[PDB]
């Protein structure tokens, strides 16, 4: 017997690597019933035509798992949606590689979806660890009115309520606005000084421009942000000493491809040893039923903890995301980013580089009236 997995990649050269991966997959341990085949397609500028072709390749090849990826054209919001919606009808597992938005984390909507990189609303643990190590108890939250901001706010609120402590204030600003001075002026007259920002770059530029006018980003303050606000065009108005977070393998794709190939091969090896299985549906237009071993395949994929790969252990959690991902804490000095800390997954540790806090000087600012 043979089983074949499908891929939706945006580079022909990657197809050279991906094939090699399965060529390496059915070389370490094969030679009976596990003759893996690889079928690949390419991304389409149009979104409607993606589903027709995706179940056309489903029909022609009756694949078991689909490996999706992100294109270079930056919208990164609806690119894997047509594949996840169509493949979710038959409950065939689909695991992404370079997706970060938190809408796909909801298991109620996207029934069968797995991720390799942690979502955007998953770095609040880094902020909590930084607060613990630097001993900042009074914070000011400032988020945007959207799914990502609400999810991050909920996660941070739960994490802080685990300690029976709450944030001083929670500001919510309209995404894509043009006048911010009122809210920031209101937040200016308070007690806490630590300001945590989580929003998109386009409005992050407006937030920075508004804040820089009110003489509030001077000395004695502390700024913490995510990853989106550091990259992009929002670096023009970023004040000095703004602490930020970065993933250690956020852009590499060959490592993710090898990781996905290895974990899928291990899952299929562990699953094919059990009887009472049914082949995928034959055609996209054939019949409307449900895969018998869909949820079983999803469970056996979730329980699969990879031993060691190019990106470390690949142990999932009971959500569809990745656990124990390293982080790099970067401070920018004089418009230049330099890594100053590293977060293993449990507790962060610093490096041998004295940071420069906002407004110059070098101390350990605390923050209080």
């Amino acid at each position, epitope marked *: 017997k043979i089983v074949n997995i499908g891929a939706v990649l945006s580079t022909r050269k990657h197809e050279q690597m991906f094939r090699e991966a399965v060529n390496q997959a059915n070389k370490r341990h094969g030679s009976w019933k596990i003759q893996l085949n690889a079928t690949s397609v390419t991304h389409k500028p149009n979104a409607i035509q993606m589903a027709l072709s995706v179940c056309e390749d489903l029909i022609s090849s009756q694949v078991y798992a689909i490996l999706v990826s992100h294109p270079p054209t930056p919208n990164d919001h609806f690119t894997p949606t047509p594949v996840s919606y169509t493949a979710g009808f038959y409950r065939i597992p689909v695991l992404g590689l370079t997706t970060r938005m938190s809408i796909y984390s909801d298991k109620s909507i996207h029934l069968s979806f797995l991720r390799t990189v942690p979502p955007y609303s998953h770095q609040s643990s880094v902020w909590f660890e930084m607060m613990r190590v630097y001993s900042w108890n009074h914070i000011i939250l400032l988020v945007s009115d959207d799914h990502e901001g609400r999810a991050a706010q909920k996660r941070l609120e739960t994490l802080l309520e685990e300690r029976e402590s709450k944030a001083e204030k929670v500001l919510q600003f309209d995404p894509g606005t043009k006048n911010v001075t009122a809210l920031l002026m209101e937040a200016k007259e308070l007690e806490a000084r630590v300001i945590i920002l989580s929003a998109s770059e386009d409005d992050a530029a407006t937030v920075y421009r508004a804040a820089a006018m009110l003489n509030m980003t001077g000395s004695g303050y502390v700024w913490l942000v995510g990853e989106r606000e550091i990259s992009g*065009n929002a670096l*023009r108005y970023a004040p000095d000493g703004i602490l930020g977070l970065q993933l250690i393998n956020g852009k590499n794709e060959s490592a993710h491809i090898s990781d996905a190939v290895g974990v899928v091969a291990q899952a299929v090896h562990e699953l094919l040893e059990k009887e009472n299985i049914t082949d995928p549906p034959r055609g996209c237009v054939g019949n409307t039923n449900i895969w018998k071993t869909g949820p079983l395949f999803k469970r056996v994929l979730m329980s699969s903890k990879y031993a060691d790969g190019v990106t470390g252990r690949v142990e999932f959690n009971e959500d569809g995301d990745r656990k124990f991902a390293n982080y790099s804490i970067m401070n920018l*000095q*004089n*418009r230049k980013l330099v890594q100053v800390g590293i977060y293993n997954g449990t507790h962060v540790i610093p490096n041998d*580089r*004295k940071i*420069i806090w906002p407004g110059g000087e070098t101390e350990k600012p605390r923050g209080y009236q």
Partner: antibody
Amino acid sequence: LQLQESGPGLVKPSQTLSLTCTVSGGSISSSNWWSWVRQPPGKGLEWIGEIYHSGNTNYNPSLKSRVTVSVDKSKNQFSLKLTSVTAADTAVYYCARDVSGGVNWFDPWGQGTLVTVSS
Amino acid sequence: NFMLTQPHSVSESPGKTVTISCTRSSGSIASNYVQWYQQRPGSAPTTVIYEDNQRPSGVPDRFSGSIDSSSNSASLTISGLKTEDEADYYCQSYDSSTVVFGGGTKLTV
């Protein structure tokens, strides 16, 4: 605020070179940055590195592992310690102060010294 | 890291206007500022343009600049040329990793 440059002329090939730029009319302990830039004869301008007043440096990636910049605010002078020099390093060397700003802007540049490497 | 390309020398007659540009090769000049530096031979180079439209209070009002973001270029519109303008001009911009200068320009009368 004005900057003064002083270099020990030419140096022997494949040796260590040390320039000393002094600042008169201001205090090193401030919220600015101090940097070095060099220009080969009839060529472009290449940035070397910047050093903050207190503790930390930044270097050009091409020549990162050949420079150990230093400062001393007890006497208000910063020094360059280029090591493992080559034959094609003869250039005019400048010491320039750049404000903290939010932009990288060099003002005011020093007089500059001429540095030649040969035997 | 990247590189800046600008033409070498421009010919012009007194009493008119000329423009030169150092077009960015890799990336786009929209997330960083550009600065234009004067340089008289045998002298320390001095600032003539910063933030693309500022002017220090030591230079006569004959310089201006703009960014089009179409060909990724910046302008150095100079009006009312005189005999005290024969010098070399530089353009400089930064990024998130390093700071790089440009080439050269030999304005002639």
